[PDB]
Design a protein around this nucleic acid. Structure first.
Ligand SMILES: [Zn+2]
Lengths: 35, 42, 97, 55, 147, 76, 227, 90, 179, 293, 206
RNA sequence: UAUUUAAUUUUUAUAAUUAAUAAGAAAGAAGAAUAUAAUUUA
RNA sequence: AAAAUAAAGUAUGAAUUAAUAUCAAAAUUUUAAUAAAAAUUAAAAAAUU
């Protein structure tokens, strides 16, 4: 399937969200409740 | 065999075999008391 | 911490302070190579400036830092610098008792 | 092949886009402002003007 | 546990030039900034230079993203933003004795003087920062939420 | 017939010249590095006949350059 | 594999591209002689998926040169067919590249292709050469006269001197092309290629020598003209 | 080209034209100054019992275009706090 | 060749032409007149026959096979069309799809459920194909001159369709004979 | 089982009605068949009923018994009091989803020790770009949601044109949602993430690693409405960065997604309260989470 | 209250003025144009390029209801320029797609631009302001003539590049999805039926 | 090799009113290739 | 089933095969033995793998 919604990808914009920050944030929330 | 808008009601179309694909008739086949038998006496 | 972009947020600080107690034996006189984002190249240029120490990297005037990361070129320097800035005080505290 | 193909079967292959893209296709070009040779954009020459600024 | 050596900035000052010209010009900035806030010498503490990014695509609002003159609150009905004002940032820290109100007051006075400094570009410390020494931009940071 | 020569497509949209707009060329250039080389500010994907600048295209967070009318020699 | 020499040749984006060869051993051999040649002579005209490989590998060699470590010296020494070029690699590149951290090698795609096959030609260089000791002013637009002569120097740069230990080696290497047994090898090569037959290879009686003494006494002349 | 897709090839544009002829009704019920959405009567018999004796229900849903025209035109009010701050129980 | 290999197709986006709007050597619309056929009570097949012959152009004295000149027939009230006796329940409509499982055997009643119009279209198809099969343009072109409306509401007031007054001479009911 | 009960149209008549059968004279509804005003068109053997003590007494009893016992008969109130338009009709309402991006992968625990593999999706900018009702036919309406704001020079010159005509800021990507007329929201509406309740089940359409795939059951785990993420307990076969089209799974085997027991959605669009400002708000206090599975 | 960041200056020519954001911004960011009809006609004529044509139309189709009668007359006059009665009305064709056996013809962005103009006009003159066509015959005739100039009732010749091979792009749809985008666009439907029914008073009463 | 199926004809802003069980300017590498749409770089 | 090798490629350029009309797709029965032979209904676009 060759359409535009499917082919186009958002990789280039990934700096707009802090992936590494949220992972560590939920690490904090992991140790806060003690899993 | 459903495409387009499908309503959250659990099975509406299931008795005509699961589809919406004609629906533009006002006229169907009829026993007595069915639709186009409006105009006949019984 | 390690992978943060741009500015270092305060939450990120919390991370470092959490991992302070993660490693039981640490002293402000510890070698540079225990820091986040201190590579081979980043350690070496600090050494020729006569800096072996977490205290010593916490003693930087920030115009030593930038020419460390611009004129010289140890990248991610402000990360390790700031990493010192945070952690040097708690370390002294844990050193006393 | 089970049979001789007539001129029509031989001519059927040229209607295809694969054939046209491969064989009869004109290339787009301009004049290299440094070398004055015909040039396709994106392909340069071994000349010390054309390596740094590659026109 | 109380929050350690994090410092809340006063202003963040931008420059269109890259980071390598400005290291020469750092000491001449503080001498100007001190008389912007009318504080004595050594009062302001400038942070490390930050060269942000050379963005081909320009992702907006990003940690390294070059700032632009136009602002949404500043011009609402403009359908786009004015192009890039600042490629490098350096932070402005005051003494730690200034509480949150004071810091923001010295932050506001600065935008006050600098805006007009850019509009004189249509002797006093403003255009000294603007004209012969480059700084094209300034901002007040957002208070970080993370405590 | 008049000759079969094509007029300039160098300023039109091209899908294989389109990819090189946002691509990173730092190693290709020794002395002369430019901010973004293939990228024409205000024009759709680097093409000069596709000018969008100083039109009504609403782009809240990205810059747009103003309109100056293109010369005759830049198009063809 | 994250180690800045050792090569991963795949097609996935984490891997640098595999250029066609017989075996990964063969790929390694090829890569090694390419890197050796590029370090010896700053440019390589290299076709195919080989050139990006050369780019990345050259960047690795400059990284090792900036390391300036005995382990780095040794690991680069494992990699090259030339020991001497390793010494060249640790004398030249640090001063050359002291102001740059990233992308040390410039790749330039040539608009000409091999006649032999459709594979494209790339021109791979080291970057800034005005900081280099032996490569200071050289012109690569066209080749030298006979390929054992030192290459062209730009007219404004004529009077440049090069590290003595390098032109010693270069002259020792070039001095075996002036003996007549090389001329016999040349004619005999004509015979061989003509037998394997390859077109446009003249008969060995038409093959008049690469090196004569008149040409040497003018070449050395202009060479001390550059000195 | 079977029977049926040729059939629809010809006739679906004709169905469209026919319902266009249906839409002009409202149009001269517009032009002469009347403004009315032609109403559909409510049906009180939607609840029934079939031959196997169980409960059968018919669903009649009536679309109001004067509501729709208001629905698209302006925002809804603020989402009530009982909705997002408490989860949906599984 | 004369007729090309590259041919207009159903999957091809150019689409399939409508012969009413087409202008071609063998299509003459100049001398046509519009008819109105009320199908109330008349048997489906008969109506199909009459409509087929007005549509085809066979009702004219000057009718020529290769020259397609029809009259537009507006067939009104398809819903009231009468099929005699058990036939609604017993008369098959069979087609074969090319794929594993080549049989659809479908009662008139089911086709009438889906569309009543498709029944009249089906029998028109049959009565036109009875004399024209071997060429596609001669099969398809007439059929578009039928306007099938399943009740008394039609767009065509502007053509002033003349009521087509026809009584079926055949006394007996229609008889399904198909091998 | 997977069929509902079969009732024929012939079988719905006065003797089958659960409630009293009502005849329609058009200005008035009565329980007697309309007596035609022209008496000579009365058919033979037909009783024109002006009064019936049999069918009127049951109606008499029924109505009173309704007003007299309103607490028992509240379901009966469905007969006399139909729901008006909008107001989230449970069976008739279909709202739109929004366009996400597969951001990364993560791991969580529930209350118990259980390892989950979450996939984290990102909702960069979701705005209602377009309304399309096709020729005014009922049940044909679409709402087009765009995502990921993109510089002016990106799209082919015909795409940008579309966005200029719409008035909406230029988006990377647009997807249509078929929806009912009541579920509309105006053009340019910023969509938030808590449009999706953490308890619900979501239909997902994305590109496989290389055709399109649809997952019709997948429950929401967790929502970051600061960074506009949403977490899901699945491992997709999908490239990171793939645009993923979201919808509500509208029925699970005879059960409606939204009902009084299960819950109710914020219907046409979610809207945030005027008093909250996300620029003052941290990540951890911004968290929403499902009930335990 | 006050700027969060500094604003770099620009002179009078290069500001982005001419538009306004919607009343409720944080919820709806739609952009509505305030541009006068003079400068939109000016933008249409002075910069003849395709994108400025589309850019003119997207503004003057946003603002149809918000202007008077004569202001519309100059609009349709300006817009009717590149149209010849003899020539095909709406065909703007850019790409020849030879992908299939017989070459496909793809239009450019101008087509849906003009069509969107006609549909905006439909919303203005029929639904929300039904009185306007009856009040002044001037724009009745102007709209009618513009609507005859582009040929709205044979869209098939919008897509036809050679009159020997008439293209069915508009009248054809297949169920596997060909021509969902070029499908039956009711374009002049509501308008023409309405402005026929303005003349449909056959009643002798009035 | 013929039929037959399956895939493709190289980003289609969009998908399904029916059949059966869908297509906007173009080719080198889709990567300037060592997973950042430039990590400052002469 | 990971690893190594080989397939769009520029150049050279054979061999088996060849009664054929631009082709022969689907189904049903019949005809002196598969029946691409009939008749009828039907519904097979082009290129490449
Ligand atoms: Zn050149």
């Amino acid at each position: 399937t060759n359409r535009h919604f499917f082919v186009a990808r958002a990789n280039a914009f990934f700096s707009r969200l802090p992936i590494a920050r949220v992972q560590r944030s939920l690490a904090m929330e992991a140790v806060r409740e003690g899993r | 065999n459903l495409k387009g808008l499908v309503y959250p009601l659990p099975y509406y179309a299931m008795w005509r075999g699961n589809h919406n694909k004609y629906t533009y008739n006002k006229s169907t086949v009829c026993l007595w008391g069915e639709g186009d038998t409006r105009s006949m006496y019984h | 911490g390690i992978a943060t972009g741009g500015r270092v947020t305060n939450e990120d600080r919390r991370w470092w302070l959490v991992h302070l107690e993660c490693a039981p034996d640490i002293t402000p006189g510890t070698f540079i190579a225990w820091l986040d984002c201190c590579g081979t190249h980043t350690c070496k240029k600090l050494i020729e400036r006569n800096i072996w120490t977490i205290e010593q990297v916490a003693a930087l005037d920030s115009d030593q830092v930038d020419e460390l990361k611009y004129r010289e070129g140890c990248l991610k320097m402000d990360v390790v610098w700031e990493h010192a800035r945070t952690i040097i005080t708690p370390l002294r505290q844990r050193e006393v008792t | 092949p089970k049979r001789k193909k007539n001129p029509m079967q031989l001519r059927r292959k040229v209607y295809g886009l694969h054939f046209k893209e491969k064989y009869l296709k004109m290339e787009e070009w301009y004049y290299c402002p440094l070398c004055a040779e015909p040039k396709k954009p994106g392909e340069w020459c071994r000349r010390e003007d054309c390596r740094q600024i590659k026109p | 546990s109380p929050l350690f050596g994090a410092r809340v900035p006063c202003c963040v000052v931008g420059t269109l030039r890259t980071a390598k010209e400005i290291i020469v010009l750092k000491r001449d900035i503080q001498s100007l900034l001190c008389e912007l806030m009318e504080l004595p010498q050594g009062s302001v503490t400038l942070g490390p230079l930050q060269q942000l990014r050379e963005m081909m695509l320009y992702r907006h609002g990003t940690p390294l993203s070059p700032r632009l003159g136009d602002e949404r609150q500043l011009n609402m009905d403009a359908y786009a933003r004015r192009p890039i004002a600042a490629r490098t940032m350096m932070d402005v820290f005051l003494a730690e004795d200034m509480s949150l109100d004071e810091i923001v007051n010295f932050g506001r006075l600065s935008l006050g003087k600098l805006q007009i400094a850019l509009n004189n570009l249509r002797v006093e410390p403003a255009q000294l920062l603007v004209d012969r020494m480059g700084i094209s931009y300034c901002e007040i940071p957002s208070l970080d939420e993370s405590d | 017939t008049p000759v079969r020569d094509r007029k300039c497509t160098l300023q039109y949209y091209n899908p294989i010249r389109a990819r090189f707009v946002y691509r990173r060329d730092k190693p290709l250039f020794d002395k002369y590095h430019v901010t973004a080389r293939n990228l024409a500010p205000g024009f759709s994907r680097g093409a000069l006949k596709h000018d969008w600048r100083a039109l009504g295209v609403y782009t809240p967070d990205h810059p747009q350059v103003p309109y100056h009318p293109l010369q005759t020699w830049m198009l063809g | 594999t994250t180690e800045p020499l050792m090569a991963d040749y795949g097609w996935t984006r984490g891997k640098l591209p595999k250029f066609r060869a017989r075996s990964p051993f063969h790929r390694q051999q090829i890569a090694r002689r390419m890197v050796t040649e590029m370090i010896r002579k700053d440019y390589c005209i290299v076709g195919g998926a080989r050139a990006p490989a050369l780019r990345i590998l050259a960047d690795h060699v400059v990284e090792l040169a900036k390391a300036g470590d005995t382990d780095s010296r040794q690991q680069l020494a494992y990699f090259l067919h030339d020991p001497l070029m390793v010494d060249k690699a640790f004398d030249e590149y640090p001063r050359r590249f002291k102001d740059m951290n990233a992308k040390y090698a410039m790749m330039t795609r040539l608009k000409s292709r091999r006649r032999t096959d459709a594979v494209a030609m790339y021109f791979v260089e080291y970057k800034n050469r005005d900081m280099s000791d032996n490569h200071k002013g050289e012109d690569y637009s066209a080749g030298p006269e006979r390929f054992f002569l030192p290459p062209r120097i730009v007219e404004t740069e004529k009077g440049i001197q090069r590290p003595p230990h390098m032109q010693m080696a270069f002259d020792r290497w070039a001095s075996k092309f002036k003996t007549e047994e090389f001329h016999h090898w040349w004619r005999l090569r004509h015979a061989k290629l003509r037998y394997w037959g390859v077109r446009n290879v003249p008969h060995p009686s038409d093959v008049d020598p690469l090196w004569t003494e008149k040409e040497e006494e003018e070449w050395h002349n202009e060479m001390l003209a550059n000195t | 080209d079977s029977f049926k897709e040729h059939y629809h090839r010809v006739h679906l544009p004709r169905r469209l034209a026919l319902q266009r002829y249906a839409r002009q009704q409202s149009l001269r019920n517009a032009a002469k100054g009347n403004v009315k959405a032609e109403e559909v009567p409510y049906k009180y018999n939607r609840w029934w019992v079939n031959e196997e004796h169980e409960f059968v229900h018919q669903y009649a849903f009536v679309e109001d275009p004067e509501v729709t025209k208001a629905k698209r035109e302006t925002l809804p009010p603020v989402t009530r706090e009982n909705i997002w701050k408490e989860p949906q129980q599984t | 060749p004369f007729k090309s290999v590259l041919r207009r197709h159903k999957h091809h986006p150019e689409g399939l032409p409508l012969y009413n709007d087409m202008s071609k050597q063998w299509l003459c619309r100049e001398g046509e007149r519009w008819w109105l056929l009320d199908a109330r009570g008349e048997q489906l097949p008969r109506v199909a026959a009459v409509a087929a012959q007005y549509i085809t152009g066979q009702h004219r004295p000057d009718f020529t096979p290769g020259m397609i000149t029809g009259d537009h027939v507006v067939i009104v009230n398809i819903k009231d069309v009468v099929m005699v006796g058990d036939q609604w329940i017993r008369v098959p409509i069979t087609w074969q799809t090319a794929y594993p499982g080549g049989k659809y055997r479908i009662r008139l009643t089911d086709m009438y459920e889906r569309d009543p119009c498709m029944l009249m279209w089906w029998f028109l198809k049959d009565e036109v194909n009875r004399h024209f099969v071997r060429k596609l343009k001669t099969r398809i072109a007439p059929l578009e001159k039928a306007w099938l409306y399943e009740d008394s509401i039609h767009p065509h007031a502007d053509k002033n369709p003349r009521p087509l007054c026809w009584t079926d001479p055949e006394v007996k009911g229609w008889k399904y004979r198909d091998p | 089982r997977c069929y509902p009960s079969l009732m024929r149209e012939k079988d719905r008549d006065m003797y089958h009605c659960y409630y009293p059968y009502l005849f329609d004279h058009g200005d008035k509804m009565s329980l007697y068949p309309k007596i035609p005003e022209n008496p000579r068109e009365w058919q033979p053997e037909q009783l024109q009923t002006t009064y019936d003590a049999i069918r009127e007494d049951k109606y008499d009893a029924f109505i009173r018994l309704r007003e007299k016992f309103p607490e028992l008969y509240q379901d009966t109130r469905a007969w006399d009091n139909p729901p008006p338009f909008g107001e989230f009709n449970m069976f008739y309402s279909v709202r739109f989803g929004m366009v996400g991006v597969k951001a990364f992968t993560c791991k969580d625990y529930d209350e118990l020790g259980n390892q989950f593999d979450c996939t984290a999706f990102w909702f960069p900018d979701n705005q209602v770009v377009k309304h399309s009702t096709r020729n005014g036919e009922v049940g044909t309406d679409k709402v087009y949601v765009g995502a990921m704001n993109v510089p002016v020079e990106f799209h082919k010159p015909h795409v940008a044109a579309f966005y200029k005509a719409a008035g909406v800021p230029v988006k990377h990507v647009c997807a249509g949602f078929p929806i009912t007329p009541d579920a509309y929201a105006p053009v340019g509406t910023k969509l938030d993430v808590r449009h999706f309740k953490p308890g619900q089940e979501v239909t997902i359409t994305f590109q496989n690693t290389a055709a399109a795939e649809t997952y019709q059951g997948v429950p929401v785990w967790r929502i970051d409405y600061k960074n506009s993420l949403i977490y899901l307990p699945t491992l997709l076969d999908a490239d990171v960065g793939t645009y993923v089209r979201f919808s509500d799974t509208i029925n699970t085997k005879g059960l409606t997604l939204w009902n009084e027991h299960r819950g109710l959605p914020a219907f046409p669009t979610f809207i945030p309260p005027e008093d909250e400002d996300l620029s003052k708000l941290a990540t951890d206090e911004c968290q929403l989470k499902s009930p335990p599975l | 209250r006050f700027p969060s960041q500094t604003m770099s200056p620009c002179s009078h020519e290069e500001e982005m003025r001419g538009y306004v954001v919607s009343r409720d911004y944080p919820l709806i960011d739609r952009l509505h144009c305030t541009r006068s009809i003079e400068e939109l006609v000016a933008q249409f004529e002075d910069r003849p390029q395709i994108e400025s044509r589309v850019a003119a139309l997207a503004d003057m189709a946003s603002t149809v209801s918000f202007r008077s009668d004569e202001e519309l007359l100059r609009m349709f006059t300006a817009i009717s320029a590149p149209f010849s009665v003899d020539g095909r009305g709406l065909n703007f064709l850019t790409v020849k797609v030879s992908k299939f056996g017989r070459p496909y013809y793809v239009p450019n962005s101008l087509l849906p631009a003009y069509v969107n103009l006609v549909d905006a006009t439909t919303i203005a003159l029929v639904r929300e302001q039904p009185w306007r066509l009856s009040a002044s015959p001037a724009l009745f005739i102007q709209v009618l003539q513009f609507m005859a100039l582009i040929k709205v009732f044979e869209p098939n010749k919008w897509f036809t590049f050679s009159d020997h091979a008439p293209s069915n792009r508009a009248d054809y749809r297949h169920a596997i999805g060909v021509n969902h985008s070029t499908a039956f666009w009711g374009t002049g439907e509501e308008l023409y039926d309405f402005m026929v029914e303005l003349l449909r008073v056959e009643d002798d009463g009035r």
